[PDB]
Ligand binder design. Structure first.
Ligand SMILES: CCCCCCCCCCCCCCCCCC(=O)OC[C@H](COP(=O)(O)OCCN)OC(=O)CCCCCCCCCCCCCCCCC
Ligand SMILES: CCCCCCCCCCCCCCCCCC(=O)OC[C@H](COP(=O)(O)OCCN)OC(=O)CCCCCCCCCCCCCCCCC
Ligand SMILES: CCCCCCCCCCCCCCCCCC(=O)OC[C@H](COP(=O)(O)OCCN)OC(=O)CCCCCCCCCCCCCCCCC
Ligand SMILES: CCCCCCCCCCCCCCCCCC(=O)OC[C@H](COP(=O)(O)OCCN)OC(=O)CCCCCCCCCCCCCCCCC
Ligand SMILES: CCCCCCCCCCCCCCCCCC(=O)OC[C@H](COP(=O)(O)OCCN)OC(=O)CCCCCCCCCCCCCCCCC
Ligand SMILES: CCCCCCCCCCCCCCCCCCCC
Lengths: 504, 605
């Protein structure tokens, strides 16, 4: 019942913040903050009323809440929403990241902030709809709908120091990658629906009915290949990854766009929710390729992040490595590794959000982003280098923060399944520590390598310090007490794992 | 005994307060907060030891919460306390309290006072978490905290890039060892289904009754983690460069916290290593080789701090030899005694470098006993304990127990290597002392110096570790046999100091004859660069990493996926050649398409 409101409250709030700009140019940010607060409060009330800690695994389908309304009855297409533990955790993470994205764009008092906040609201609503839709056509519809505002935000409100043509090229590469991969996803959805129609004879686009489909091997492999290609573009998985640093480098300088739809891992949710239960045998056959692609992604992202002279590209390649870890976790088939993947997803979202917000504040302070034109910023800034050290320590997998917890249950489950992938990924963790220390020592340590870093810089405001300390507190609590997060997502992970292992 | 968590809470509170102070507080208030946090940890530890001995030395467990719970994967925040944990908890807390007093005197007027004290408080908290942990994952949390605090404190002078490079290399080497430790964790949980040490000892011989290869792998990876943290083969190269940090950082690393973690990991999981005799033999061999190579390196070093670094390496090799010969009590006794005298030596060296200008070579210094005699006698007793001078130093009794356990179990070669190491240890220690302090001239801190002066003598040897019921007892020797081994060790130490005095006290003519000789130059340059281990690790690991990064910095996979974009542009520009704007060509193309369509229809009819 609350899920349609969970989707359309961002849309209505985007409409109101677009229409309220005539009442004042400082108004739409308040409207966006209020709307995201209502969305997060609705998600938290759903968390309280769901009873996810006491829910046991009963098999797919098992939704703690549901909603259905026919949309295109010719094809058996309905707006069908459902929430369980993992989807609600991702929706809560989306709400929190949207709140931080709205607060991070507080100082933009430009003449078209209403369109900016409407696009932000539409991105967050599309992400929530992706996390909520259990109708495949609706899931694809949200999947492509959350990217047009991303394209317009990158191409129009992007990096103002860079020329427009670079922003056009970056946004167009991102949109071409995502839309072509999703078109392959839609072809897979249509072919699965037609296989179901030939087998039974009833038109449907529901994930519940498409689970129990009779089919041979090779068609299922191709269908899983289409789904995996779409998710692997969105994850990212190498070599389908360059859109991530291209879009991160030419993003808006606040960094709210990275939080709005880029740092929310819809691809791993799609792999857990759609790739494994609908095509279990094909995923089991694809597991070696998936784990080795994750290994190559981890080490490639490490070698790229060390080689980058840019902070945003560095964090993008850290994201590439951490989603390589998650892709390794997803195909193992272990409940421990799946829970670690969920924890790693949430903690990586928080840590990369902190890193992106800190990089945006640093660029606002020093008006440059090349690391060869700074150094020794510890003595010239009050709060930013210490929090940057904490978040870089978080990203390398340090205990006391949830990233270590997540990737260590990932490696525990993986070693219970496959040892060689685990040991190579653990040397990838060595590489992760290497690139985090390299970023820290190029940016905030040493001597000043230019004129801008040799002078004092203004400190943070109460809002920026509040949001960074909130992310720090959440990451520390996740590192030391991850049990509510594990107990929330235990039922859906158990359903997915039992479906994956009871059919292969 | 219920205040076992206060030893973590108080340093954590001090670290948080001093980090969020950001240097706004005065130096006296920051010193009060940091030193009071570590001193309240020491006082709570003293009360814990009093209550531990009052109840008859019973193992205590204090759970707080369950960390992770997924199926059979159950990890909890449970602290444990037995004799070994209490022993090095007392060592860490007392030595860190003395070091914090010395550093509160030492770092007056320095930039980063509160940051330094916050980092040292987090170091103390991480090591207390390490030594109090009941399972391998909480110990791993303390392990990584120790590594991170060491990295932050080594590169404390962040303005100098050399300090940052040294801290980065130390963190990378420790993280490689930490990865080996995580390998051991993964193997142990995959085989036994638990991470509590007592549960491993309970369920290991039943599970490993048929096959023992996985337990061998787990113990080998534990050994790899231990040699990573304790700076042994093959992960020892970080310490000499890590010397670049401040003096109390060096004292905390080499005496209290960092180098003792590997010994804790070997001694705490002594049952699993007892189930793998070959790995324990490898521990002993690794310790012997490290102590020999460390002595040969420290013989030719040209700085006080590097000599002390390789001396720490040699004594950790002694402890690893003691663990390898199943002399656990000797290892922990040497752990505490070496903590005392190495802390004393490092604080005395920091006092020396404060009193004598900036950093200088040892050959620059000469005849320093007259100007600074208090720290000269501090160096004297610290070197006597380092060189195991008989009947006056606790180091003699510790090394005596180590060698007695070595020869009591048939390890003759390890005993010979230990004797040669003691000879070389006396040689390099009194070489440094006679070079620095003999020749021609060219209340906050006195109390820790006094305490480490007293504890470096036999007063430190009077403290008996409470290790009954935790570690197995070393096999006893015949009284005449250990008397002969004691007099042999004393003769070796006395001939070492006599040879050092004959070589370096006066006009060094025999020393400069060996040093300026071409084989002497070759051996000195070999040993001065840590036997070429840093060179090998740069040429085998660092250089191909930099080469791969430089080769990949243009993102080749992005170009491989940008191939169809340039193919599309080329194909479009080629197809635009047909639109030349000529009507006759348009009619010709229509007729060409007519022939193509017609012929295709007839060939496929
Ligand atoms: C894993 C592989 C198998 C699955 C693949 C699934 C498809 C999705 C993932 C791959 C997407 C690859 C997209 C590559 C192009 C990205 C867009 C781009 O780079 O646009 C910018 C570029 C112009 O940039 P510039 O260099 O400035 O050129 C000067 C122009 N005056 O613009 C251009 O040069 C023109 C762009 C034309 C439109 C884009 C190209 C589309 C080509 C077909 C893509 C479908 C897959 C083909 C096979 C892939 C490999 C097997
Ligand atoms: C302008 C020029 C440039 C731009 C354009 C470039 C080209 C774009 C198009 C590229 C893709 C071409 C088509 C790929 C699919 C081929 C499908 C195929 O050959 O299927 C044959 C067969 C069908 O299965 P069948 O045997 O009929 O099943 C019934 C038996 N029970 O299938 C089988 O038996 C199983 C076959 C499984 C594998 C088929 C797909 C291979 C894909 C290779 C690349 C991806 C590798 C995996 C993912 C890596 C990471 C992304
Ligand atoms: C460039 C981007 C787009 C990629 C290229 C375009 C799509 C290429 C798809 C290639 C498909 C090759 C199929 C070859 C066999 C065809 C004949 C056949 O044997 O059909 C079997 C079956 C129909 O017979 P039926 O009685 O229904 O038997 C049920 C079988 N279980 O057939 C069926 O039931 C339906 C078969 C459907 C097969 C899957 C089609 C979509 C797969 C996802 C997209 C392509 C793969 C991923 C991308 C590759 C790289 C780009
Ligand atoms: C050992 C290491 C100790 C310190 C660890 C880090 C402390 C800071 C962060 C803590 C975040 C997580 C706290 C979780 C507390 C909790 O829920 O404890 C539950 C427990 C009651 O027992 P029960 O509910 O049955 O537990 C079973 C759980 N499945 O409750 C209890 O038993 C009481 C627990 C009280 C804990 C008080 C901690 C105070 C910390 C003060 C300093 C903060 C330093 C912050 C920075 C740390 C380093 C990054
Ligand atoms: C017998 C062997 C037993 C095992 C031995 C394991 C040895 C592990 C590696 C030890 C050496 C680590 C050296 C780290 C140095 C860090 C400080 C440094 O030199 O920094 C320089 C550079 C800084 O980067 P930047 O600021 O961008 O550049 C400025 C210009 N210099 O930063 C860099 O250049 C960073 C270079 C990082 C290199 C990391 C290499 C890791 C290798 C791990 C191998 C693990 C093998 C395990 C066993 C396998 C057995 C089959
Ligand atoms: C989806 C975002 C998740 C962020 C991390 C949250 C981690 C869980 C924190 C829960 C609170 C822990 C501290 C208070 C515990 C109180 C326990 C009371 C009952 C014993």
């Amino acid at each position: 019942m609350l899920l349609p409101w969970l989707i359309l409250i961002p849309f209505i709030g985007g409409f109101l913040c677009w229409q309220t700009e005539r009442f004042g140019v400082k108004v739409p940010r308040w409207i966006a903050l209020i709307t995201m607060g209502l969305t997060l409060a609705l998600s938290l009330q759903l968390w309280l009323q769901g009873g996810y800690s006491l829910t046991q695994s009963a098999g797919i389908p098992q939704w703690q809440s549901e909603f259905d309304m026919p949309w295109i009855p010719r094809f058996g297409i309905s707006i069908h929403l459902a929430i369980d533990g993992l989807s609600l955790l991702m929706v809560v993470l989306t709400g929190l990241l949207g709140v931080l994205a709205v607060l991070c764009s507080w100082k933009e008092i430009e003449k078209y902030q209403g369109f900016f906040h409407l696009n932000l609201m539409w991105i967050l609503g599309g992400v929530i709809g992706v996390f909520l839709a259990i109708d495949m056509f609706l899931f694809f519809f949200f999947w492509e709908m959350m990217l047009v505002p991303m394209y317009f935000l990158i191409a129009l409100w992007g990096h103002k120091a860079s020329d427009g043509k670079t922003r056009i090229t970056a946004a167009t590469k991102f949109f071409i990658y995502t839309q072509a991969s999703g078109l392959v996803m839609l072809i897979a959805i249509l072919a699965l629906v037609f296989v179901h129609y030939n087998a039974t004879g009833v038109w449907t686009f529901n994930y519940e009915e498409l689970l129990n489909t009779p089919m041979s091997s090779g068609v299922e492999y191709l269908l899983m290949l289409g789904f995996f290609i779409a998710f692997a573009v969105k994850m990212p998985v190498v070599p389908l990854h360059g859109w991530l640093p291209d879009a991160h480098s030419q993003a808006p300088t606040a960094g709210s766009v990275d939080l709005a739809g880029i740092l929310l891992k819809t691809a791993a949710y799609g792999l857990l929710r759609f790739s494994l239960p609908l095509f279990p045998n094909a995923s089991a056959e694809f597991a070696p390729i998936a784990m080795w692609l994750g290994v190559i992604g981890i080490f490639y992202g490490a070698w790229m992040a060390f080689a980058q002279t840019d902070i945003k590209r560095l964090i993008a390649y850290t994201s590439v490595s951490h989603m390589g870890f998650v892709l390794i976790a997803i195909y193992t088939g272990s409940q421990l590794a799946y829970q670690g993947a969920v924890i790693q997803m949430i903690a990586h979202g928080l840590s990369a959000a902190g890193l992106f917000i800190l990089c945006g504040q640093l660029y606002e302070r020093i008006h440059t982003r090349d690391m060869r034109m700074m150094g020794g910023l510890w003595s010239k800034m009050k709060w930013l280098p210490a929090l940057s050290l904490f978040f870089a320590v978080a990203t390398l997998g340090m205990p006391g923060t949830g990233n270590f917890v997540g990737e260590f249950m990932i490696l525990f489950g993986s070693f219970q399944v496959v040892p060689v992938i685990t040991v190579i990924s653990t040397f990838g963790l060595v590489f992760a520590s290497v690139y985090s220390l390299a970023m820290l020592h190029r940016a905030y340590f040493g001597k000043a390598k230019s004129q801008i870093a040799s002078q004092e810089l203004p400190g943070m405001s109460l809002r920026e310090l509040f949001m960074i300390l909130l992310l720090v507190v959440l990451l520390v609590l996740l590192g030391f007490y991850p049990q509510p997060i594990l107990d929330t997502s235990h039922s859906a992970i158990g359903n997915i794992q039992q479906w994956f292992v009871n059919s292969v | 005994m219920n205040m076992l968590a206060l030893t973590i809470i108080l340093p954590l509170i001090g670290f948080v307060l001093l980090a969020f102070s950001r240097g706004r507080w005065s130096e006296n208030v920051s010193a009060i907060v940091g030193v009071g946090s570590v001193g309240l940890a020491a006082l709570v530890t003293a009360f814990i030891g009093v209550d531990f001995f009052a109840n008859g030395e019973q193992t205590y467990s204090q759970p707080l919460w369950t960390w992770m719970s997924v199926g059979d994967f159950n990890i909890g925040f449970n602290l444990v306390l037995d004799g070994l944990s209490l022993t090095m908890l007392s060592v860490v807390t007392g030595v860190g309290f003395l070091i914090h007093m010395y550093a509160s005197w030492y770092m007056r007027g320095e930039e980063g006072y509160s940051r330094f004290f916050a980092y040292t408080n987090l170091f103390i908290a991480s090591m207390v978490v390490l030594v109090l942990a009941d399972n391998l994952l909480l110990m791993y949390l303390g392990w990584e905290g120790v590594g991170l605090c060491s990295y932050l404190l080594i590169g404390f002078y962040y303005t100098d890039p050399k300090n940052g490079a040294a801290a980065m290399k130390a963190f990378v080497v420790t993280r490689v060892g930490d990865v080996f430790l995580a390998f051991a964790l993964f193997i142990l949980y995959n085989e036994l289904g638990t991470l509590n040490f007592r549960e491993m000892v309970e369920l290991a011989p039943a599970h490993f009754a048929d096959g023992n290869n996985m337990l061998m792998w787990a113990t080998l990876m534990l050994l790899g983690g231990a040699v990573g943290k304790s700076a042994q083969l093959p992960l020892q190269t970080w310490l000499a460069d890590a010397m670049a940090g401040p003096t109390p950082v060096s004292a905390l690393i080499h005496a209290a916290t960092m180098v003792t973690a590997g010994v804790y990991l070997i001694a705490r999981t002594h049952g699993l290593f007892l189930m793998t005799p070959e790995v324990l033999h490898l521990v002993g061999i690794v310790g012997a080789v490290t102590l020999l190579l460390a002595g040969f390196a420290a013989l030719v070093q040209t700085d006080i701090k590097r000599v002390l670094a390789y001396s720490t390496m040699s004594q950790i090799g002694y402890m690893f030899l003691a663990l390898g010969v199943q002399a656990w009590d000797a290892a922990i006794f040497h752990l505490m005694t070496h903590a005392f005298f190495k802390a004393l030596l490092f604080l005395a060296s920091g006092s020396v470098i404060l009193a004598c200008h900036h950093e200088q070579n040892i050959f620059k210094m000469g005849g320093l006993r007259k100007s600074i005699p208090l720290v000269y006698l501090c160096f004297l007793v610290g070197g006597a304990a380092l060189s195991a001078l008989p009947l006056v130093t606790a180091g003699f009794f510790s090394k005596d127990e180590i060698l007695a356990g070595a020869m009591a179990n048939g390890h003759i070669n390890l005993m010979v290597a230990g004797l040669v190491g003691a000879f070389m240890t006396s040689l390099y220690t009194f070489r440094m002392i006679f070079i620095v302090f003999h020749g021609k001239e060219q209340v906050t801190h006195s109390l820790p110096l006094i305490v480490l002066l007293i504890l470096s003598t036999f007063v430190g040897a009077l403290i008996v570790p409470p290790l009954q019921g935790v570690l197995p007892q070393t096999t006893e020797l015949a009284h005449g046999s250990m008397l002969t081994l004691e007099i042999t060790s004393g003769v070796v130490a006395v001939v070492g100091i006599l040879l050092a005095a004959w070589l370096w006290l006066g006009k060094r003519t025999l020393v400069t004859s060996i040093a300026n000789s071409a084989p002497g130059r070759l051996l000195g340059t070999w040993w001065y660069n840590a036997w070429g281990f840093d060179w090998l690790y740069d040429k085998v690991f660092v250089k191909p990493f930099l080469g791969i990064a430089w080769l990949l910095k243009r993102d080749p996979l992005n170009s491989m996926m940008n191939i169809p974009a340039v193919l599309s542009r080329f194909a479009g520009k080629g197809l635009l050649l047909s639109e030349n704007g000529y009507l006759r060509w348009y009619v010709a193309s229509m007729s060409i398409g007519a022939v193509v369509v017609l012929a295709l229809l007839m060939v496929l009819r």
